[PDB]
From a paper:
Motivated by our success in designing and validating the structure of deeply knotted trefoil proteins, we turned to a more complex knotted topology: a ‘pentafoil’ or 51 knot (right), which has not yet been observed in the protein structure database. One construct, based on the kcTRP5b backbone and referred to here as kcTRP5b.1, yielded crystals that diffracted to 2.4 Å resolution. A molecular replacement search with the kcTRP5b.1 model yielded a highly significant solution; subsequent refinement and iterative model building revealed good agreement between the design and crystal structure across the core alpha helices, but divergence in two of the four repeat-repeat loop connections leading to a globally dissimilar topology. Despite the perfect repeat symmetry in sequence, the observed structure is asymmetric, with two repeat connections (R1-R2 and R4-R5) matching the design and two diverging to enable local repeat-repeat packing (R2-R3 and R3-R4). As a result of these topological differences, the observed structure forms a trefoil knot rather than the intended pentafoil knot. All local and non-local residue interactions formed in the design model are also observed somewhere in the crystal structure (allowing for equivalence between repeats); thus, it is tempting to speculate that the designed sequence is in fact compatible with the intended pentafoil topology, but folds to a more kinetically accessible trefoil topology under experimental conditions. The only pentafoil design that could be structurally characterized at high resolution, kcTRP5b.1, misfolded to an alternate topology with significantly lower contact order than the design model. This alternate structure showed striking agreement with the design model in the packing of the inner and outer alpha helices, but the sequence order of the helices in the barrel differed due to changes in the conformation of two of the four inter-repeat connections. Given that the observed structure validates essentially all the local and non-local interactions in the design model (allowing for equivalence between repeats), it may be possible to rescue the design by introducing changes to the sequence that break repeat symmetry and destabilize the misfolded structure.
Residue numbers in the entry: -6 to 2, 4 to 27, 32 to 275
Write the structure that this text describes.
């Protein structure tokens, strides 16, 4: 009845998440800074205080991350749906229902439960990651003048090679959300690495090796403090998700011309609905 609590790990997905979240967090702290190290330690202290607060009421770090993700992914899905509705000239509800229809068709083909009978976070993740990945696929296909199928098959090939170069199973035998995250995170990382390489005037390899080194150093420090790789990922996701949420709220408020508190109120109604769930 016990599982990964026995020390048997998704190691590929964990490394990829460390790399991607580290990239995204570095960009966010650089934009927020004052000093970046000051912002980093400030965010660390705020997250630690919030963790103590949720411990004082009996909420674990994993559950805190789960609720924060419900907030963040709700915001990201809302922004993506709104942008697609505007680009297509239809309402947000139409885009939402088309996304649900498409994802449920794919799950049918796979002989799996649909989004309606899945857990709240898993359903939100499936919807959001499907839309993000499809947007990235169509963008890269347009940019390279190739087929969307070509893009998706090259991405699946690259991720499958990476997986099999680590004694792990292929992309064909992973569960739905894990494969979806593997694909999405790989694509997002490649795009971020390439754009930063162009912006800073250095090679892609420079960026990627700096990233790998930053992550290995953080992991060695955590191991020195007696912190597990899973806990390291959870702390990094807490920091990053808080920063992403705050940026999304600020930007949506500035774009709609409303106060930040109105953005939060709308999000909080919608989210407390799924939180009672």
């Amino acid at each position: 009845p016990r599982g990964s609590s026995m020390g048997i790990s998704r190691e590929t997905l964990e490394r990829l998440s460390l790399l991607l979240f580290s990239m995204q967090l570095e960009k966010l702290v650089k934009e927020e800074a004052v000093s970046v190290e000051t912002i980093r330690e400030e965010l660390e202290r705020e997250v630690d205080e919030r963790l103590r607060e949720m411990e004082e009421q009996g909420i674990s770090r994993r559950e805190t991350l789960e609720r924060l993700s419900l907030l963040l992914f709700s915001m990201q899905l809302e922004k993506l749906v709104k942008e697609e509705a505007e680009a297509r000239g239809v309402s947000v509800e139409t885009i939402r229902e088309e996304l649900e229809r498409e994802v449920d068709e794919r799950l049918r083909e796979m002989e799996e439960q649909g989004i309606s009978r899945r857990e709240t976070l898993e359903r939100l993740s499936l919807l959001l990651f499907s839309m993000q990945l499809e947007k990235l696929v169509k963008e890269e296909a347009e940019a390279r003048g190739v087929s969307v199928e070509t893009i998706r098959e090259e991405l699946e090939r690259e991720v499958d090679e990476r997986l099999r170069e680590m004694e792990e199973q292929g992309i064909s035998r992973r569960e739905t959300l894990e494969r979806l995250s593997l694909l999405l995170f790989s694509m997002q990382l490649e795009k971020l690495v390439k754009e930063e390489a162009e912006a800073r005037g250095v090679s892609v390899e420079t960026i990627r090796e700096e990233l790998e080194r930053e992550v290995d150093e953080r992991l060695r420090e955590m191991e020195e403090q007696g912190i597990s790789r899973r806990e390291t990922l959870e702390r990094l996701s807490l920091l990053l998700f808080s920063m992403q949420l705050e940026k999304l709220v600020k930007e949506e408020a500035e774009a709609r011309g409303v106060s930040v508190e109105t953005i939060r109120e709308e999000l909080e109604r919608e989210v407390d609905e799924r939180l009672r769930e």
